[PDB]
A and B are shown apart, each in its own frame.
Chain A
Amino acid sequence: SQDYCTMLYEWLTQGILNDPYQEFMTYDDLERAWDTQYFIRKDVLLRDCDSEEDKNLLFKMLRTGILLKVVRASLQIPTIPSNSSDITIQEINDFADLMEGSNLELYVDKCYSRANEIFLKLFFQG
């Protein structure tokens, strides 16, 4: 799980998804090019999402990464620094620990919040 959670980490904290082996819960179109379509890979999801809580989590996770992707695109930066919104998101060290308990929910909320605060700062003031 180390690589999977690494892939996830970057998606959630940087909006960076690099999935040459198609493992990830999501992917997009466009491999001008702004009409990005998004896809949910139901078959590789961590949670089946037949429950409201998991559906809500899934979408928050997608938004997190999407908001970050937009910021990177607007700023034309490869990465969003730790010196941006003052939220530190630790790496996933243990996948199972993240799956255990509502750790995804809090982890993602932190991630989401960072994506959201950064996004909002730029959109409102920039």
Chain B
Amino acid sequence: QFDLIRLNNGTIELNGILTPKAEVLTKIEKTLNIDELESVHNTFLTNILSHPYPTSL
């Protein structure tokens, strides 16, 4: 839960985690919704499509 965003200038700044782990001290499923699932799919395509030339091979 320590997801940081790397910037192109080398700075890596925490984000999406801007909470103290959201600890509540005194005391429920982290599922994905449809667009989030769609995002994961597109994320995959990006991870490979965005991965010297491919033509060296």
- Report A's interface with B, CB cutoff 8 A: 32, 34, 74-76, 121-123, 125-126
Q: How many residue-residue contacts, CB under 8 A, span A and B?
A: 19
Q: How many residues of B contact A (CB 8 A)?
A: 8
Does B19 make an interface contact (CB < 8 A)?
yes
Q: Are A75 and B24 in contact (CB under 8 A)?
A: yes
Main secondary structure of the interface of A (DSSP, over half): helix
Contact of B15 among A32, A122, A123, A125 (CB under 8 A): A32
Contact of A121 among B15, B22, B25 (CB under 8 A): B25
Name which of A32, A75, A123, A125 has the most chain B CB atoms within 10 A of its CB: A75
Within 8 A of A (CB), among B11-57: 15, 18-20, 22-25
A selection of 19 A-B contacts at a CB cut-off of 8 Å is A32-B15, A32-B18, A34-B18, A74-B19, A74-B20, A74-B22, A74-B23, A75-B24, A76-B19, A76-B22, A121-B25, A122-B23, A122-B25, A123-B20, A125-B25, A126-B20, A126-B23, A126-B24, A126-B25
